[PDB]
Design a protein around this ligand. Structure first.
Ligand SMILES: O=C(O)Cc1c[nH]c2ccccc12
Length: 569
C-alpha cells in the first residue's frame, strides 16, 4: 500500500511508551528534576547533533523533492503568519510581543526528531524511503525560517520590559538570529551540509561507528527526557489561557496538517497519482507532530509565556498520539477495498482497546486504591469504568478470535457485545443517579438494582440477540457479527440511555460536574454509535462518510476509557 499503516501503532507505542517511561520515572522520582538535566544535556548536546550530522552528511540532495519542502515550509509560514498576526491583534498590550513570538513558534515547530522520525520511519522506511530525508530538511529549515521572527518579537518584549534600555533594532534582530544560529539543530545542519559536500556524502568509516552510536541513542533517550520534562508541568490555567492553548494546539495539530496537505496538492504538480497521494498524506502526518520541546526551552530562556508553552507542549504531545493514529488510518481508508477496510477498523479497535484498557486499569486502580469508589456517585462511576474495561478486554479477544472457530467467536462475542451494551446503560444509569443524588439527600439510591440492571439488561439484550437474531459471524466486524438485529439492539440501548441521561441531566439542572461531563462526552459517542447503527441499516450501500463514522464510533467505543483516564486519572 501507499503507507504501511499497520506499523504505526508499534511506532506510537515505542514513542509514547518511552515518553510514559520518562513520565513514570519522574513521577516515581527514579530520576529527580535536577537529575533529568543530565539526560537532557546528553540528548541535546551529543545525541541529537550526532544524528543531525550523520543524516545531513548522508543526504542525497539530487533526490530531494523540494516541492515537499516548499509546501511544508509555506504551510508552516502560513500558520506562523496567521497565528502571529492574529496574536498581535488579539493579545493585550503588555504581553503581545512575547505571545506573538512564542505562540507562532509553538503552532509551527514540530517534535520532528524524537517523535516524528520513529513514526515516519515506521510508516515509510520500506514504501517511500526518501520521505525520511525531509524530517532533517523541513525541521531545521523551519527553524532557520520562522524561529528568528518569533525570537525577534521576544526580544522586542525583553526590550520593552526593560524600560531603562531603549536600545537598537539591530541588536533585537541580531540577537534573535544569533539564538537561531546557536541552536544545535541549525548549526549541525550547516556543518552537516558542509561535510555532505566535502565528503561526497560518505561518512568516514572510522567516524561512522561513533555517529551511529551517538545518533542511534537519540530517539529513546530524547523520548525519555521528554517524559521527564512533562512531569509536574500542566499547571491549572485560566479559562482564557486554556482557550488560547486549545486554539494553539488546534493550529498545530489540525490547521497546520490541513495546510500542509493542501500545499502539497498545490505544488506537487508531478504526474504520479499514488506518489502525489502518499506525499500529500505524509504532509498531513508531518503537520500532526507535537510541539517541539525546544519551544518550552526558548520560553524558559526568555521567561515568557512559560506556563502556556510548557503545558501546551505537554498536552500537544499527548493529543498528537490519537490524532496521528486516527488521521493516518483515516487517510489510508480511501486506498482500501471494503474487506481490508473492515479488517482495518477491527485492527484500529484492537489497537485502541489495548491502550484504553491500560488507561482504564490504571484509572480503576486509582479510584479503588484511593477508596474513592466508596462514595456515590463514584461507586457507580467506578462501575462505568469497569464497564468500559470489559468492553476493551472483549475487543482484544475478538481480534485474537476473529478466525479461530465458530464457538469461541460466539462466546467472545457474548462478552464483547454485553460489555458494549453495559457501557451504554451505565452512561444513562450514572446520569439518572446524578439526578437522584441531586434530588434530595434523604433519597437512598437503588445501587443494587442499578448494578443488577447495568449488567443484567445488557446480558439480557445479548441473550435476546442470540435468540431473535442469527449468526452473521462470517463478517469481520464484531459490531456486525449479529447483523441487523445487533444494530437495532444497539440503537435501542443507546436511545434509552440518551433519554435517561437527557431527562435526568435536565431535572438535575432544574463530584457532580466531572460525572455530568463524562455522561455528556459519552452521549456524543452514544449518538455517534446510534447514528452509525440506523445509518448502517438503511444506507445498505454506505459511503465514505460511513466508514469514517464507523471509525470514529469505534474510536469512541473503545477509546472512551481515555475519557475516564482524563476525568479520573
Ligand atoms: O523536537 C525535537 O524532536 C528535537 C528535540 C530537541 N531536544 C529534545 C528533547 C527531547 C525530545 C526531543 C528533543
Amino acid at each position: 500500500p501507499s503507507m504501511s499503516i499497520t506499523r504505526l501503532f508499534p511506532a506510537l507505542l515505542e514513542c509514547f511508551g518511552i515518553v510514559l517511561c520518562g513520565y513514570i520515572a519522574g513521577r516515581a522520582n527514579v530520576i529527580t528534576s535536577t537529575q533529568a538535566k543530565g539526560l537532557g544535556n546528553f540528548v541535546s548536546r551529543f545525541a541529537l547533533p550526532a544524528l543531525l550530522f550523520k543524516n545531513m552528511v548522508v543526504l542525497n540532495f539530487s533526490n530531494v523533492d523540494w516541492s515537499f519542502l516548499y509546501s511544508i515550509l509555506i504551510a508552516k509560514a502560513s500558520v506562523f503568519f496567521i497565528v502571529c498576526v492574529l496574536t498581535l491583534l488579539v493579545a493585550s498590550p503588555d504581553s503581545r510581543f512575547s505571545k506573538a513570538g512564542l505562540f507562532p513558534i509553538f503552532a509551527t515547530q514540530s517534535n520532528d526528531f524524537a517523535l516524528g522520525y520513529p513514526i515516519v520511519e515506521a510508516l515509510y522506511q520500506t514504501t517511500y524511503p526518501e520521505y525520511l530525508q525531509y524530517i532533517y530538511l523541513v525541521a531545521p529549515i523551519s527553524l532557520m525560517m520562522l524561529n528568528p521572527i518569533g525570537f525577534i518579537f521576544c526580544e522586542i518584549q525583553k526590550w520593552k520590559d526593560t524600560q531603562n534600555a531603549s536600545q537598537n533594532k539591530i541588536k533585537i534582530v541580531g540577537l534573535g538570529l544569533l539564538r537561531v544560529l546557536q541552536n544545535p539543530i541549525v548549526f549541525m545542519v550547516f556543518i552537516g551540509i558542509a561535510f555532505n559536500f566535502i565528503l561526497d556524502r560518505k561518512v568516514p568509516v572510522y567516524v561512522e561507528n561513533f555517529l551511529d552510536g551517538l545518533g542511534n541513542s537519540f530517539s529513546g533517550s530524547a523520548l525519555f527526557y521528554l517524559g521527564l520534562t512533562m512531569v509536574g508541568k500542566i499547571k491549572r490555567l485560566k479559562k482564557s489561557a486554556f482557550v488560547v492553548l486549545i486554539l494553539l494546539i488546534t493550529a498545530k495539530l489540525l490547521v497546520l496538517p490541513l495546510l500542509c496537505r493542501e500545499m502539497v496538492e498545490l505544488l506537487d504538480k508531478g504526474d504520479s497519482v499514488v506518489n502525489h497521494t502518499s506525499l500529500s498524506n505524509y504532509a498531513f502526518l508531518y503537520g500532526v507532530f507535537p510541539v517541539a520541546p525546544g519551544v518550552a526551552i526558548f520560553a524558559t530562556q526568555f521567561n515568557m509565556e512559560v506556563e502556556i508553552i510548557t503545558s501546551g507542549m505537554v498536552i500537544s504531545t499527548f493529543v498528537s498520539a490519537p490524532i496521528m493514529y486516527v488521521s493516518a488510518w483515516l487517510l489510508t481508508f480511501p486506498t482500501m477495498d471494503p474487506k481490508p477496510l473492515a479488517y482495518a477498523i477491527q485492527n484500529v479497535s484492537f489497537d485502541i482497546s489495548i491502550v484504553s484498557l491500560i488507561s482504564l486499569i490504571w484509572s480503576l486502580a486509582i479510584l479503588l486504591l484511593s477508596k474513592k469508589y466508596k462514595q456515590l456517585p463514584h461507586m457507580l462511576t467506578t462501575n462505568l469504568l469497569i464497564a468500559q474495561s470489559i468492553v476493551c478486554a472483549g475487543m482484544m479477544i475478538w481480534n485474537f478470535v476473529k478466525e479461530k472457530n465458530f464457538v469461541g467467536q460466539i462466546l467472545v462475542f457474548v462478552l464483547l457485545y454485553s460489555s458494549l451494551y453495559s457501557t451504554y446503560l451505565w452512561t444513562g444509569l450514572l446520569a439518572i443517579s446524578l439526578f437522584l443524588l441531586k434530588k434530595r439527600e434523604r433519597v437512598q439510591i437503588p445501587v443494587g438494582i442499578i448494578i443488577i440492571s447495568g449488567w443484567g439488561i445488557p446480558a439480557l439484550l445479548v441473550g435476546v440477540l442470540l435468540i431473535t437474531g442469527k449468526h452473521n459471524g462470517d463478517s469481520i466486524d464484531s459490531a456486525f457479527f449479529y447483523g441487523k438485529e445487533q444494530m437495532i439492539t444497539t440503537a435501542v440501548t443507546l436511545f434509552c440511555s440518551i433519554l435517561i441521561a437527557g431527562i435526568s441531566l435536565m431535572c438535575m439542572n432544574q463530584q457532580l460536574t466531572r460525572h455530568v461531563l463524562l455522561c455528556l462526552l459519552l452521549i456524543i459517542g452514544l449518538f455517534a454509535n446510534l447514528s452509525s447503527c440506523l445509518w448502517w441499516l438503511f444506507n445498505q450501500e454506505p459511503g465514505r462518510l460511513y466508514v469514517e463514522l464507523q471509525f470514529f464510533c469505534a474510536v469512541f467505543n473503545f477509546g472512551q476509557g481515555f475519557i475516564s483516564f482524563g476525568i479520573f486519572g
